[PDB]
Design a protein around this nucleic acid. Structure first.
Length: 51
DNA sequence: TTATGTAATACGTCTGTAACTTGTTCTTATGTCTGTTATGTAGTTAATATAATTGAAGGATTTTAAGA
């Protein structure tokens, strides 16, 4: 019982944290493309820079 | 006739050359270990900033799939 409860608490905490981080990065995607706009035509394509 | 003594001659042979072989001894080239320096990798930085990009151009015909 104890290990099951610990596992459930771990899982819910990690899921919450992952969801929050995913929301944050999905927000800042635009800042990514903005900054990566400035380093094109240097041997790497635009989308590699974005990634 | 026959002993004798010189002489040609053929065969051993003693010694001088040379081949086969090893000791060993010295020299050198190489492989390896170790110490030091340069190279290669990696992590971090906290005013704020939040949908590219650059061209490119008078083509003339066929055949074959999608759309209706």
């Amino acid at each position: 019982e104890r290990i099951k409860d610990i596992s459930h608490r771990m899982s819910i905490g990690e899921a919450k944290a992952r969801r929050a981080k995913k929301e944050m990065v999905e927000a800042n995607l635009r800042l990514v493309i903005s900054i990566a706009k400035k380093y094109t035509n240097r041997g790497l394509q635009f989308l590699d820079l974005i990634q």
